[PDB]
């Protein structure tokens, strides 16, 4: 699960700095 736009794509704040794991596309 890569960037949904790549770019750095997150749904949150805590989701956003934890975008490591699972980017929320």
Do not use: A, I, K, V
């Amino acid at each position: 699960c890569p960037p949904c736009h790549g770019r750095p794509t997150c749904d949150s704040f805590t989701n956003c700095w934890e975008l490591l794991t699972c980017p929320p596309c």
